[PDB]
Structure 1
Amino acid sequence: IPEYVDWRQKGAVTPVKNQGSCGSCWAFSAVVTIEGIIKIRTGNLNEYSEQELLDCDRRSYGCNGGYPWSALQLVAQYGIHYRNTYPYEGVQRYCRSREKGPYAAKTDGVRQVQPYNEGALLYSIANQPVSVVLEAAGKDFQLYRGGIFVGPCGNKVDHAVAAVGYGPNYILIKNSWGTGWGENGYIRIKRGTGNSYGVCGLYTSSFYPVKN
């Protein structure tokens, strides 16, 4: 795999989103990976519905948090609508998938990266954007403005984001806190530190959808 990957440069990442007060990061992360794999497999970059996963993923908890793996499973089982069809409202309501017509895209499954393994995560990122989790509770991460982020942070993961690239000493992360956070909504997180957890626990739990 090459020294640099940046799925934004290949057109596989939609604009940075803002989840608002809702604890929906897990759905935003999952959607980033779906938009990416659909672009990679089909050539078309579309936006898909975070709101649909928020309402309909019965294994998650709406705005009280959730699981990127469960959302990617939901997309592999049923499907997902375009964002325009099922736009983000920032609050869990009722599942409306059956009232919004046929799904827009569908994947075929969910593979997990092997945790606590930098190269395994770099490998997946080399093939597609990947849903990852990290500790976002720290102030240093919350106030990040730019540069290669080294922490300080622990490995108490609490926040789902998406890895969309990497370089010799970082992994490139799309956050869902709006375009005003970090480097236009992205963070470059140091890698290669030899800590198995990764900076901010970045290697704890990383998933990607499979689409043939």
Structure 2
Amino acid sequence: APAAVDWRARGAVTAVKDQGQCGSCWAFSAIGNVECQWFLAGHPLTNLSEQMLVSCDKTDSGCSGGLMNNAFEWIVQENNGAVYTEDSYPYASGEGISPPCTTSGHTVGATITGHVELPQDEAQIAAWLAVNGPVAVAVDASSWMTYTGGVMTSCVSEQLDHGVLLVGYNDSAAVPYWIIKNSWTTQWGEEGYIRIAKGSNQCLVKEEASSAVVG
């Protein structure tokens, strides 16, 4: 695999968002992955709707959590693979209360056919990302509240409780790392991103990696 990859540099990643006081991280992880996969399939980079998942994804728990894999499946099996645009279905759960699910007056921004779950191995996840793009991953973000910058070489890895987006890595660095897009605004970390050591399963990053499949 290539020594270093950064999908942000190739214009495949949308701007860092804000989930607010809602535990909708799972939706941001899933949608963020779909936005990248849709762009890479030959369509212009479009901001898609997390709110669609938070409000309509009944297999998940809105502001109380969910799984990216459940979100991928709900989109395909319950929503005919349709993912609405953000402009047509704006995020409105920033206070902690999700509004009811509305199925009309929205615009379909992307369509997925399914999803693939990657092996629990960092080198294989890196290989897949290098060829296919950003990957949605679950991590333990307990120690992330105090992150200000730099490569996190020591991360509390006890329980999966947060969803993020892997956008790259650098194997040639003194301490190889992963580049991760978070959803706690650009004021957190390095303009919304966090770099964690690669190769030691920091924050349980290899445990639940997956990606939507467009075409």
Q: Aligned to 1:73, what secondary structure does the other structure show?
A: helix
Q: Write the letter of the residue equivalent to 2:185.
A: G
Q: Quote the residue 2:133 is aligned against.
A: 128
Q: Quote the residue 2:112 is aligned against.
A: 107
Q: 1:170 aligns with which of 156, 164, 177?
A: 177
The structure-2 alpha-carbon separation of the partners of 1:12 and 1:75, relative to structure 1 and needing over 3 Å to count, comes to: farther
Q: Quote the residue 2:188 is aligned against.
A: 181
5+ long unaligned stretches in structure 2: none
Q: Percent identity?
A: 37
Q: Write the letter of the residue equivalent to 2:104.
A: E
4+ long deviations beyond 6 Å: none
Q: Quote the residue 1:155 is aligned against.
A: 158
> How far apart in 2 are the matches of 1:6 and 1:43?
19
Q: Write the letter of the residue equivalent to 1:85.
A: S
> How far apart in 1 are the matches of 2:149 and 2:118?
27
Indicate if the aligned counterparts of 1:76 and 1:110 stay in contact, CA closer than 8 A: no
5+ long unaligned stretches in structure 1: none
Q: 1:81 aligns with which of 65, 70, 84?
A: 84
Indicate if the aligned counterparts of 2:20 and 2:184 stay in contact, CA closer than 8 A: yes
Q: Aligned to 1:34, what secondary structure does the other structure show?
A: helix
Q: Quote the residue 1:95 is aligned against.
A: 101
Q: Aligned to 1:80, what secondary structure does the other structure show?
A: strand
The structure-2 alpha-carbon separation of the partners of 1:188 and 1:26, relative to structure 1 and needing over 3 Å to count, comes to: same
Q: Quote the residue 2:30 is aligned against.
A: 30
Q: Deviations over 1:132-162 (max 9, x none)?
A: 0111122xx2111111111231231100000
Indicate if the aligned counterparts of 2:85 and 2:107 stay in contact, CA closer than 8 A: no
> How far apart in 2 are the matches of 1:179 and 1:189?
17
26-35 vs 122-131, greater mean Cα deviation: 122-131
Indicate if the aligned counterparts of 1:52 and 1:86 stay in contact, CA closer than 8 A: yes
**What TM-score results when the alignment is normalised by the length of structure 2?**
0.91
Indicate if the aligned counterparts of 1:134 and 1:155 stay in contact, CA closer than 8 A: no
> How far apart in 2 are the matches of 1:88 and 1:17?
10
1:102 deviation in Å? 5.0
> How far apart in 2 are the matches of 1:189 and 1:40?
25
Indicate if the aligned counterparts of 2:137 and 2:209 stay in contact, CA closer than 8 A: yes
Q: Aligned to 2:84, what secondary structure does the other structure show?
A: coil
RMSD of aligned residue pairs (Cα, Å): 1.3
> How far apart in 2 are the matches of 1:38 and 1:136?
27
1:42 deviation in Å? 1.4
- Is 2:66 aligned against 1:59? no
The structure-2 alpha-carbon separation of the partners of 1:101 and 1:182, relative to structure 1 and needing over 3 Å to count, comes to: closer
- Is 2:66 aligned against 1:72? no
